[PDB]
Homo-oligomer: 134 residues x 3
Protein backbone atom coordinates (compact mmCIF):
# COMPACT_ATOMS: atom_id res chain seq x y z
CA UNK A 1 0.00 0.00 0.00
CA UNK A 2 2.83 2.40 0.84
CA UNK A 3 4.01 4.10 -2.35
CA UNK A 4 7.62 4.19 -3.54
CA UNK A 5 8.14 6.90 -6.13
CA UNK A 6 10.87 5.77 -8.50
CA UNK A 7 12.65 7.48 -11.38
CA UNK A 8 14.27 5.55 -14.21
CA UNK A 9 17.35 7.73 -14.71
CA UNK A 10 18.19 5.32 -17.51
CA UNK A 11 14.96 4.76 -19.50
CA UNK A 12 16.55 1.83 -21.31
CA UNK A 13 16.23 -0.48 -18.31
CA UNK A 14 13.11 -2.32 -17.15
CA UNK A 15 11.29 -0.73 -14.22
CA UNK A 16 12.11 -2.69 -11.05
CA UNK A 17 9.20 -4.91 -10.05
CA UNK A 18 8.07 -7.27 -7.29
CA UNK A 19 8.06 -10.78 -8.78
CA UNK A 20 5.58 -12.04 -6.20
CA UNK A 21 3.16 -10.04 -4.04
CA UNK A 22 4.84 -11.03 -0.78
CA UNK A 23 8.46 -10.78 -1.95
CA UNK A 24 10.50 -8.56 0.36
CA UNK A 25 12.42 -6.89 -2.44
CA UNK A 26 12.43 -5.82 -6.07
CA UNK A 27 15.40 -6.58 -8.31
CA UNK A 28 17.56 -3.68 -9.44
CA UNK A 29 19.34 -3.85 -12.78
CA UNK A 30 22.78 -2.75 -13.89
CA UNK A 31 22.93 0.23 -16.21
CA UNK A 32 26.48 -0.65 -17.19
CA UNK A 33 28.59 -3.51 -18.50
CA UNK A 34 31.24 -4.45 -15.97
CA UNK A 35 33.51 -7.44 -15.47
CA UNK A 36 34.61 -8.19 -11.92
CA UNK A 37 37.85 -10.14 -11.70
CA UNK A 38 38.28 -12.45 -8.69
CA UNK A 39 38.28 -10.45 -5.46
CA UNK A 40 37.67 -7.14 -7.20
CA UNK A 41 34.86 -4.67 -6.56
CA UNK A 42 33.08 -1.92 -8.46
CA UNK A 43 30.48 0.75 -7.77
CA UNK A 44 27.77 -0.10 -10.28
CA UNK A 45 24.95 2.20 -11.41
CA UNK A 46 21.37 0.85 -11.31
CA UNK A 47 19.93 3.66 -13.40
CA UNK A 48 17.20 4.36 -10.86
CA UNK A 49 16.52 6.79 -8.02
CA UNK A 50 13.83 6.41 -5.37
CA UNK A 51 12.07 8.43 -2.70
CA UNK A 52 12.15 6.35 0.47
CA UNK A 53 9.53 7.83 2.85
CA UNK A 54 10.62 9.63 6.00
CA UNK A 55 10.58 7.08 8.79
CA UNK A 56 11.69 4.34 6.41
CA UNK A 57 14.88 3.08 4.86
CA UNK A 58 15.84 1.49 1.57
CA UNK A 59 18.06 -1.59 1.88
CA UNK A 60 20.06 -3.15 -0.94
CA UNK A 61 20.68 -6.87 -0.56
CA UNK A 62 22.67 -9.23 -2.77
CA UNK A 63 20.49 -11.65 -4.73
CA UNK A 64 20.39 -15.39 -4.06
CA UNK A 65 20.49 -18.19 -6.61
CA UNK A 66 22.99 -17.81 -9.44
CA UNK A 67 24.32 -14.55 -8.00
CA UNK A 68 25.32 -16.40 -4.83
CA UNK A 69 26.43 -19.41 -6.87
CA UNK A 70 29.08 -17.31 -8.63
CA UNK A 71 30.11 -15.46 -5.49
CA UNK A 72 28.65 -12.05 -6.30
CA UNK A 73 28.23 -9.94 -3.18
CA UNK A 74 27.97 -6.36 -1.98
CA UNK A 75 30.79 -4.69 -0.05
CA UNK A 76 28.56 -2.58 2.18
CA UNK A 77 25.60 -4.96 2.32
CA UNK A 78 23.02 -4.12 3.34
CA UNK A 79 23.22 -1.04 1.13
CA UNK A 80 21.53 1.75 3.04
CA UNK A 81 19.36 4.21 1.10
CA UNK A 82 18.27 7.06 3.39
CA UNK A 83 14.91 8.80 3.24
CA UNK A 84 16.66 11.93 2.00
CA UNK A 85 18.74 10.31 -0.73
CA UNK A 86 17.25 11.18 -4.12
CA UNK A 87 20.33 10.29 -6.13
CA UNK A 88 21.04 7.27 -8.31
CA UNK A 89 21.24 4.02 -6.38
CA UNK A 90 24.67 2.51 -6.91
CA UNK A 91 25.68 -1.02 -5.90
CA UNK A 92 29.13 -1.83 -4.54
CA UNK A 93 29.40 -5.25 -6.17
CA UNK A 94 32.32 -7.48 -5.28
CA UNK A 95 33.36 -10.83 -6.72
CA UNK A 96 34.12 -13.05 -3.73
CA UNK A 97 35.20 -16.00 -5.89
CA UNK A 98 38.96 -16.70 -5.90
CA UNK A 99 39.30 -17.55 -9.61
CA UNK A 100 36.16 -17.17 -11.74
CA UNK A 101 35.54 -13.61 -13.01
CA UNK A 102 31.98 -12.28 -12.90
CA UNK A 103 30.62 -10.58 -16.00
CA UNK A 104 27.87 -8.05 -15.41
CA UNK A 105 25.91 -7.07 -18.50
CA UNK A 106 23.83 -3.93 -18.83
CA UNK A 107 20.31 -5.04 -17.92
CA UNK A 108 21.43 -7.76 -15.53
CA UNK A 109 19.80 -8.11 -12.11
CA UNK A 110 22.52 -7.21 -9.61
CA UNK A 111 20.71 -6.71 -6.32
CA UNK A 112 17.34 -6.39 -4.66
CA UNK A 113 15.82 -3.38 -2.97
CA UNK A 114 13.73 -3.66 0.18
CA UNK A 115 11.96 -0.95 2.13
CA UNK A 116 11.41 -1.13 5.87
CA UNK A 117 10.48 1.26 8.61
CA UNK A 118 13.40 2.39 10.71
CA UNK A 119 13.32 3.73 14.25
CA UNK A 120 14.73 7.25 14.04
CA UNK A 121 15.78 6.95 17.66
CA UNK A 122 16.81 9.95 19.69
CA UNK A 123 20.13 9.14 21.32
CA UNK A 124 20.21 10.22 24.94
CA UNK A 125 23.62 9.96 26.57
CA UNK A 126 23.70 8.54 30.07
CA UNK A 127 26.61 7.94 32.44
CA UNK A 128 25.39 4.38 32.93
CA UNK A 129 22.36 2.19 32.32
CA UNK A 130 21.20 2.47 35.93
CA UNK A 131 18.64 5.03 34.78
CA UNK A 132 14.95 5.02 35.62
CA UNK A 133 12.85 4.60 32.49
CA UNK A 134 15.68 3.00 30.52
CA UNK B 1 3.39 -13.05 19.91
CA UNK B 2 3.50 -13.44 16.12
CA UNK B 3 3.78 -17.12 15.25
CA UNK B 4 6.45 -18.60 12.99
CA UNK B 5 5.46 -22.05 11.76
CA UNK B 6 8.61 -24.09 11.27
CA UNK B 7 9.24 -27.55 9.85
CA UNK B 8 12.28 -29.61 10.79
CA UNK B 9 12.99 -31.17 7.40
CA UNK B 10 15.82 -32.96 9.17
CA UNK B 11 14.40 -34.28 12.48
CA UNK B 12 17.90 -35.03 13.73
CA UNK B 13 18.66 -31.37 14.42
CA UNK B 14 17.55 -29.32 17.43
CA UNK B 15 14.59 -27.02 16.81
CA UNK B 16 15.87 -23.45 16.42
CA UNK B 17 15.20 -21.42 19.56
CA UNK B 18 15.50 -17.90 20.94
CA UNK B 19 18.23 -17.97 23.59
CA UNK B 20 16.86 -14.89 25.33
CA UNK B 21 13.37 -13.39 25.14
CA UNK B 22 14.54 -10.18 23.50
CA UNK B 23 17.10 -11.70 21.11
CA UNK B 24 16.49 -10.58 17.54
CA UNK B 25 17.23 -13.97 16.02
CA UNK B 26 17.24 -17.72 16.53
CA UNK B 27 20.28 -19.79 15.58
CA UNK B 28 19.98 -22.11 12.60
CA UNK B 29 22.02 -25.32 12.50
CA UNK B 30 23.85 -27.08 9.70
CA UNK B 31 22.35 -30.33 8.50
CA UNK B 32 25.62 -31.26 6.81
CA UNK B 33 29.33 -31.62 7.48
CA UNK B 34 31.29 -29.19 5.35
CA UNK B 35 34.83 -27.84 5.40
CA UNK B 36 35.38 -24.38 3.94
CA UNK B 37 38.93 -23.78 2.75
CA UNK B 38 40.21 -20.18 2.89
CA UNK B 39 38.15 -17.94 0.63
CA UNK B 40 35.79 -20.71 -0.42
CA UNK B 41 32.01 -20.75 -0.13
CA UNK B 42 29.26 -23.35 0.05
CA UNK B 43 25.47 -23.44 0.05
CA UNK B 44 24.71 -25.19 3.33
CA UNK B 45 21.40 -26.82 4.30
CA UNK B 46 19.85 -25.89 7.66
CA UNK B 47 17.33 -28.71 7.63
CA UNK B 48 14.44 -26.35 8.35
CA UNK B 49 11.70 -24.57 6.43
CA UNK B 50 9.57 -21.71 7.74
CA UNK B 51 6.40 -19.82 6.89
CA UNK B 52 7.25 -16.13 7.11
CA UNK B 53 3.93 -14.22 7.32
CA UNK B 54 2.78 -12.08 4.41
CA UNK B 55 3.96 -8.55 5.12
CA UNK B 56 7.11 -9.85 6.77
CA UNK B 57 10.51 -11.12 5.76
CA UNK B 58 12.95 -13.67 7.11
CA UNK B 59 16.55 -12.47 7.32
CA UNK B 60 19.60 -14.69 7.75
CA UNK B 61 22.53 -13.03 9.48
CA UNK B 62 26.00 -14.40 10.22
CA UNK B 63 26.57 -15.11 13.91
CA UNK B 64 28.96 -13.10 16.07
CA UNK B 65 31.51 -14.43 18.55
CA UNK B 66 33.54 -17.43 17.43
CA UNK B 67 31.90 -17.43 14.00
CA UNK B 68 33.22 -13.92 13.41
CA UNK B 69 36.49 -14.80 15.13
CA UNK B 70 37.22 -17.45 12.49
CA UNK B 71 36.01 -15.33 9.59
CA UNK B 72 32.80 -17.19 8.80
CA UNK B 73 30.40 -15.05 6.79
CA UNK B 74 27.48 -15.23 4.39
CA UNK B 75 27.88 -14.34 0.72
CA UNK B 76 24.42 -12.84 0.30
CA UNK B 77 24.00 -11.54 3.84
CA UNK B 78 21.44 -10.66 4.85
CA UNK B 79 19.88 -13.86 3.52
CA UNK B 80 16.38 -12.96 2.39
CA UNK B 81 13.57 -15.45 3.05
CA UNK B 82 10.38 -14.27 1.35
CA UNK B 83 6.88 -14.74 2.73
CA UNK B 84 6.16 -17.21 -0.06
CA UNK B 85 9.29 -19.33 0.31
CA UNK B 86 8.35 -22.64 1.94
CA UNK B 87 11.51 -24.47 0.93
CA UNK B 88 14.54 -25.44 2.98
CA UNK B 89 16.54 -22.48 4.22
CA UNK B 90 20.07 -22.74 2.86
CA UNK B 91 23.00 -20.60 3.99
CA UNK B 92 25.67 -19.38 1.58
CA UNK B 93 28.57 -19.65 4.02
CA UNK B 94 31.95 -18.29 3.02
CA UNK B 95 35.29 -18.48 4.80
CA UNK B 96 36.74 -14.98 4.67
CA UNK B 97 39.97 -15.99 6.41
CA UNK B 98 43.06 -16.11 4.14
CA UNK B 99 44.64 -19.25 5.61
CA UNK B 100 42.65 -21.06 8.32
CA UNK B 101 40.00 -23.48 6.97
CA UNK B 102 36.61 -23.53 8.67
CA UNK B 103 35.13 -26.89 9.59
CA UNK B 104 31.35 -27.02 9.81
CA UNK B 105 29.95 -30.05 11.60
CA UNK B 106 26.40 -31.31 11.27
CA UNK B 107 24.56 -29.72 14.18
CA UNK B 108 26.74 -26.61 14.29
CA UNK B 109 25.15 -23.17 14.58
CA UNK B 110 25.89 -21.45 11.27
CA UNK B 111 23.62 -18.42 11.21
CA UNK B 112 20.73 -16.68 12.91
CA UNK B 113 17.25 -16.08 11.59
CA UNK B 114 15.36 -12.86 12.25
CA UNK B 115 11.85 -11.89 11.22
CA UNK B 116 10.83 -8.31 10.53
CA UNK B 117 7.97 -6.56 8.85
CA UNK B 118 8.76 -5.33 5.37
CA UNK B 119 7.05 -2.54 3.46
CA UNK B 120 5.62 -4.16 0.35
CA UNK B 121 5.81 -0.81 -1.38
CA UNK B 122 4.02 -0.13 -4.63
CA UNK B 123 6.54 1.35 -7.03
CA UNK B 124 5.10 4.30 -8.92
CA UNK B 125 7.29 5.57 -11.73
CA UNK B 126 7.62 9.33 -12.03
CA UNK B 127 9.55 11.46 -14.51
CA UNK B 128 11.09 13.34 -11.60
CA UNK B 129 10.65 13.88 -7.87
CA UNK B 130 8.91 17.22 -8.37
CA UNK B 131 5.61 15.46 -7.74
CA UNK B 132 2.90 16.59 -5.35
CA UNK B 133 2.38 14.05 -2.58
CA UNK B 134 5.85 12.55 -3.00
CA UNK C 1 10.71 9.84 19.15
CA UNK C 2 11.82 6.47 20.52
CA UNK C 3 14.76 6.99 22.88
CA UNK C 4 18.09 5.19 22.60
CA UNK C 5 20.06 5.42 25.83
CA UNK C 6 23.75 5.41 24.98
CA UNK C 7 26.88 5.32 27.12
CA UNK C 8 30.21 6.65 25.92
CA UNK C 9 32.48 4.02 27.46
CA UNK C 10 35.31 6.05 25.96
CA UNK C 11 34.56 9.73 26.74
CA UNK C 12 37.24 10.83 24.28
CA UNK C 13 35.09 10.05 21.26
CA UNK C 14 32.28 12.17 19.82
CA UNK C 15 28.77 11.05 20.73
CA UNK C 16 27.25 9.24 17.72
CA UNK C 17 24.73 11.46 15.95
CA UNK C 18 22.20 11.41 13.12
CA UNK C 19 23.60 13.63 10.35
CA UNK C 20 20.16 14.23 8.87
CA UNK C 21 16.75 13.84 10.51
CA UNK C 22 15.66 11.02 8.21
CA UNK C 23 18.97 9.13 8.08
CA UNK C 24 18.51 5.47 8.97
CA UNK C 25 21.68 5.25 11.02
CA UNK C 26 24.19 7.10 13.17
CA UNK C 27 27.92 6.70 12.57
CA UNK C 28 29.94 4.83 15.17
CA UNK C 29 33.59 5.72 15.72
CA UNK C 30 36.65 3.60 16.39
CA UNK C 31 38.12 3.83 19.86
CA UNK C 32 41.37 2.30 18.64
CA UNK C 33 44.04 2.70 15.98
CA UNK C 34 44.14 -0.36 13.75
CA UNK C 35 45.63 -1.15 10.36
CA UNK C 36 43.91 -3.83 8.30
CA UNK C 37 46.17 -5.50 5.76
CA UNK C 38 44.53 -6.81 2.57
CA UNK C 39 42.02 -9.53 3.39
CA UNK C 40 42.53 -9.25 7.14
CA UNK C 41 39.89 -8.61 9.78
CA UNK C 42 39.77 -7.21 13.30
CA UNK C 43 37.22 -6.82 16.08
CA UNK C 44 37.24 -3.07 16.66
CA UNK C 45 35.89 -1.26 19.73
CA UNK C 46 33.48 1.66 19.19
CA UNK C 47 33.71 2.91 22.75
CA UNK C 48 29.93 2.99 23.14
CA UNK C 49 27.20 0.82 24.62
CA UNK C 50 23.48 1.18 23.96
CA UNK C 51 20.16 0.01 25.34
CA UNK C 52 18.13 -1.23 22.38
CA UNK C 53 14.47 -1.43 23.52
CA UNK C 54 12.79 -4.80 23.96
CA UNK C 55 11.01 -5.55 20.71
CA UNK C 56 13.74 -3.85 18.71
CA UNK C 57 17.17 -4.64 17.39
CA UNK C 58 20.35 -2.68 16.77
CA UNK C 59 21.95 -3.28 13.38
CA UNK C 60 25.51 -2.36 12.42
CA UNK C 61 26.02 -1.66 8.73
CA UNK C 62 29.21 -0.80 6.86
CA UNK C 63 29.34 2.82 5.70
CA UNK C 64 29.16 3.85 2.05
CA UNK C 65 31.32 6.39 0.24
CA UNK C 66 35.04 6.26 0.99
CA UNK C 67 34.62 3.25 3.28
CA UNK C 68 33.20 1.28 0.34
CA UNK C 69 35.72 2.87 -2.01
CA UNK C 70 38.61 1.34 -0.05
CA UNK C 71 36.89 -2.00 0.44
CA UNK C 72 36.13 -1.74 4.15
CA UNK C 73 33.40 -4.15 5.19
CA UNK C 74 32.01 -6.03 8.17
CA UNK C 75 32.42 -9.79 8.51
CA UNK C 76 29.08 -10.40 10.21
CA UNK C 77 27.16 -7.56 8.57
CA UNK C 78 24.57 -6.71 9.54
CA UNK C 79 26.00 -6.61 13.06
CA UNK C 80 23.19 -7.64 15.38
CA UNK C 81 22.85 -5.84 18.73
CA UNK C 82 20.18 -7.55 20.84
CA UNK C 83 17.81 -5.76 23.20
CA UNK C 84 19.60 -7.37 26.13
CA UNK C 85 23.16 -6.53 25.08
CA UNK C 86 24.48 -3.72 27.27
CA UNK C 87 28.13 -4.29 26.46
CA UNK C 88 30.48 -2.33 24.23
CA UNK C 89 29.54 -2.46 20.56
CA UNK C 90 32.43 -3.96 18.63
CA UNK C 91 32.74 -3.98 14.83
CA UNK C 92 34.23 -6.93 12.94
CA UNK C 93 35.91 -4.85 10.25
CA UNK C 94 37.50 -6.60 7.30
CA UNK C 95 39.57 -5.20 4.45
CA UNK C 96 38.16 -6.75 1.28
CA UNK C 97 40.73 -5.09 -0.97
CA UNK C 98 43.41 -7.43 -2.39
CA UNK C 99 46.38 -5.06 -2.06
CA UNK C 100 45.71 -1.71 -0.37
CA UNK C 101 45.85 -1.81 3.45
CA UNK C 102 43.19 0.11 5.38
CA UNK C 103 44.32 2.34 8.22
CA UNK C 104 41.75 2.96 10.94
CA UNK C 105 42.53 5.86 13.24
CA UNK C 106 41.03 6.36 16.67
CA UNK C 107 38.06 8.65 16.08
CA UNK C 108 37.37 7.40 12.56
CA UNK C 109 33.82 6.55 11.48
CA UNK C 110 33.83 2.78 10.95
CA UNK C 111 30.16 1.83 10.73
CA UNK C 112 26.62 3.03 11.18
CA UNK C 113 24.07 1.93 13.73
CA UNK C 114 20.40 1.54 12.89
CA UNK C 115 17.51 0.56 15.14
CA UNK C 116 14.47 -1.30 13.88
CA UNK C 117 11.62 -3.22 15.40
CA UNK C 118 12.02 -6.97 15.18
CA UNK C 119 9.30 -9.59 15.30
CA UNK C 120 10.08 -11.74 18.33
CA UNK C 121 8.23 -14.59 16.68
CA UNK C 122 7.20 -17.67 18.59
CA UNK C 123 8.40 -20.68 16.63
CA UNK C 124 5.74 -23.37 16.45
CA UNK C 125 6.95 -26.66 14.99
CA UNK C 126 4.63 -28.35 12.54
CA UNK C 127 4.99 -31.61 10.63
CA UNK C 128 4.14 -29.76 7.43
CA UNK C 129 2.70 -26.47 6.22
CA UNK C 130 -0.72 -27.99 5.56
CA UNK C 131 -1.91 -26.45 8.82
CA UNK C 132 -5.05 -24.40 9.30
CA UNK C 133 -4.21 -20.85 10.35
CA UNK C 134 -0.69 -21.02 8.92
Amino acid sequence: STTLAIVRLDPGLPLPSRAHDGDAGVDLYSAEDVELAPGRRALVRTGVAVAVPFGMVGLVHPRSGLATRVGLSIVNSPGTIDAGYRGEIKVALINLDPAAPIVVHRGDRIAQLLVQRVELVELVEVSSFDEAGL
